[PDB]
């Protein structure tokens, strides 16, 4: 709510943004117990690993390929 600077700049080194596209979300029926819900939506492999998914696991491979 309170801004201490009239103008502020976040200098992100190397990384770049990407535009928002329209698409059809795929569904991968994997077997695991990391969350209770039947279906969840992820936007990057970072979020999947943050949910306890092991690197190289089926869901991780599918996501990184997609």
């Amino acid at each position: 709510e309170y801004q201490d600077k009239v103008v502020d700049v976040e200098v992100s080194l190397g990384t770049q943004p990407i535009d928002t596209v329209g698409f059809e979300t795929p569904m991968f029926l994997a077997m695991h117990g990391n969350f209770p819900e039947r279906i969840r939506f992820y936007v990057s492999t970072a979020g999947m690993v943050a949910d306890g998914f092991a690197v190289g696991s089926p869901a991780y491979q599918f996501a990184t390929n997609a």
Partner: protein, 135 residues
Amino acid sequence: IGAMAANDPSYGDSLHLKTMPGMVPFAGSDTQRSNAWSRNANIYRGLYGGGSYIEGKTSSGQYVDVIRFSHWVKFRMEESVFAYMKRRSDMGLSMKMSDEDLPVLKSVLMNNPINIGIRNGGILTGYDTENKVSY
């Protein structure tokens, strides 16, 4: 999926030669490829240094492109009609079954899919010279 997700069916853009990262070229010989084609099992092949899908065929023999186009039409005609009907009934004056109001469906449908398909090249138009029929 990454070579198919963000592809708009309205262009009729088949998967014939689309490159896909991650896959590995098929290593069998000519006879094996012929057998695979006879069984409708698509194969990723490497040609002239690159990798390329082939023939995009489905199990039933119909091209995946046609199936995607049919699903696209089926979904979006319905969505357009429902969106018009809901907006027309949200102000009162809901649609009524009479000759004086039904024909507007022609314009409603000619908007959205039937015209976007023509603009993007998915839908064909013109006069056929062989059969002497119009599209």
